[PDB]
């Protein structure tokens, strides 16, 4: 809910600096993705509603134990709000910040073999909105510039023309680009009053709607409950 509230690149990067990798990994066992299922939407239809499960839903799903699974878990947290179940990663790695994983070599993770096309297909980029895609491209650029793969990122953008139009205008390692960036990346914000307490047909739309409706209540009450446990640590 906090990560989805950020609406600027410099807010999003600041949040990733303070957030450990533990928050991007779920301890719930979940279900296997890419499964054709029938769900109940009784507000609209008497019959069951066909849908397919995906990693970028708001619900935690089982994840693979490879490096590909950990990168997919990070991106899913940014774009959907929840991570995936990857057990026994390691105490040292889980303490590191998300930005440290993406942009630093001291972590001990190797991401040179990652294929950006495969990761996008596994995350169902075709079903992602403009804000979600821009967030995903930010994570790709950070990973590419860490590995010296700047050319591969540009070539990958040439192949996918629609992704090129919405590519973020920031160069990692340059502070000027982050300062002057004017991107809008807020999936969840203070709702327009027109929003109602109604369900949505798709799994993704309903879960995103749930985050939107609960943002006002979370905004008012998160500070005190966080402080009630943070003090005397």
């Amino acid at each position: 809910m906090d990560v989805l509230s950020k609406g600027s690149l410099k807010e999003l990067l600041a949040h990733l600096e303070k957030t450990p990798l533990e928050e991007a990994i779920s301890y719930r066992i979940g279900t296997v993705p890419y499964q054709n299922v029938l769900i109940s939407r009784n507000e609209y239809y008497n019959q069951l509603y066909p849908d397919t499960t995906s990693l970028i839903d708001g619900v935690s799903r089982e994840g693979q134990r490879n490096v590909n699974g950990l990168i997919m878990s990070i991106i899913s947290y940014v774009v959907s709000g929840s991570g995936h179940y990857i057990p026994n990663i390691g105490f040292m790695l889980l303490r590191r910040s998300i930005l440290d994983i993406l942009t630093k070599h001291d972590t001990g993770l190797v991401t040179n073999n990652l294929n950006y096309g495969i990761i996008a297909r596994n995350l169902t980029v075709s079903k992602m909105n403009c804000e979600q895609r821009k967030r995903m491209l930010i994570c790709f650029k950070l990973l590419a510039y860490k590995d010296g793969n700047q050319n591969d990122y540009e070539i990958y953008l040439n192949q996918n023309i629609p992704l090129k139009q919405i590519a973020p205008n920031f160069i990692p390692g340059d502070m000027r680009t982050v300062i002057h960036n004017q991107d809008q990346l807020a999936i969840v914000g203070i709702p327009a009053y027109r929003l109602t307490q109604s369900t949505e047909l798709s799994i993704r739309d309903d879960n995103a709607k749930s985050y939107k409706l609960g943002y006002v209540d979370w905004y008012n009450s998160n500070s005190f409950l966080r402080e009630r446990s943070e003090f005397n640590l």
Binding site: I39, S40, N42, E43, V59, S82, Q197
Partner: protein, 299 residues
């Protein structure tokens, strides 16, 4: 040798492993409490010819005010409850309700999500196996009362083995004609109509004389820990309602006539102790479902 088994005990499908934490248990208990208020408010609204009692209860339940143009289906609380019910029934059903929505709906009322405060009694009789010799025919019929029809055509009397599951506490056997039943490697008593047995003692042997058939009627009682709010009458009604609405229409799942057959069958499978806890939570969820649908009707 022939083997006969109860139909409802065959191949229990795995149950869901999600929405069984402490927070999810609170959500089910809150839904049951708020559904009970909804069904009571509809009675008051009908009596007084006013929508004030129903609007107050529906707003608490659905976090939204009823509107004439829209359709009253229970709101987001109804959507989560129906989808969690499917998750409990089978492991093939997905988990599509986010944890943020579960936590939000559990804060509406303050209750303790303890599913082991009380106990309930279930009457499904488990006959795991009945073994008969070559020249005997054995037929098992029924779940609440199992009638076992046995006929011997061979020259000599036949010994027929009855195996009841180790879970059940008490089994009572009544025959159309007096018969002899005894434990394995124990002396045969005189023929009598009624036997009371504890299935944990061991397999039982029934002596069948040649001639007219003998029918044995079996009844069983098992105690399963349940929350205090558990109501078997409401749980059974919700189970049939969910089946008619198609909530349990999932691939590679087994279907049962009653919730009693479902809970007993899952208990008798391997990892049955783990499975029963999920079934009890599903029982409370079905109790909330039944009260919600009766309050808000769809023709």
């Amino acid at each position: 040798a022939n083997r006969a088994t109860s139909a409802f005990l065959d191949n229990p499908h795995p149950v869901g492993v999600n929405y069984v934490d402490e927070g999810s248990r609170q959500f089910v208990a809150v839904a049951e409490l708020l559904a009970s208020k909804l069904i009571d408010s509809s009675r008051e609204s009908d009596e007084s010819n006013s929508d004030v009692p129903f609007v107050q209860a529906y707003s608490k339940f659905a976090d939204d005010n009823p509107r004439h143009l829209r359709v009253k289906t229970g709101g987001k609380m109804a959507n989560a409850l129906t989808n969690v019910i499917r998750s409990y029934y089978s492991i093939n059903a997905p988990a599509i309700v986010p944890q943020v929505e579960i936590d939000r709906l559990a804060s509406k009322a303050t209750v303790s999500g303890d599913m082991y405060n009380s106990y309930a009694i279930f009457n499904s009789v488990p006959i795991v196996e009945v073994l008969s010799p070559a020249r005997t025919t054995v037929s098992i019929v029924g779940s609440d009362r199992a009638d076992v029809t046995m006929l011997n055509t061979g020259a000599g009397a036949a010994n027929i083995t009855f195996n009841f599951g180790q879970i059940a506490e008490t089994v009572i056997l009544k025959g159309s004609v007096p018969f002899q039943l005894a434990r394995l490697n124990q002396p045969m008593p005189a023929a009598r109509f009624t036997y009371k047995l504890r299935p944990l003692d061991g397999p039982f042997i029934v002596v069948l004389p040649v001639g007219n058939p003998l029918v044995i009627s079996a009844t069983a009682a098992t105690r399963i820990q349940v929350p205090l709010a558990f109501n078997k009458a409401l749980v059974e009604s919700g189970f049939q309602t969910a089946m008619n609405d198609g909530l349990f229409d999932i691939q590679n799942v087994n279907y049962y006539s009653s919730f009693d057959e479902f809970i007993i069958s899952q208990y008798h499978a391997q990892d049955g102790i783990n499975r029963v806890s999920t079934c009890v939570i599903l029982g409370l969820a079905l109790q909330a479902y039944d009260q919600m649908r009766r309050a808000l009707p769809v023709r």
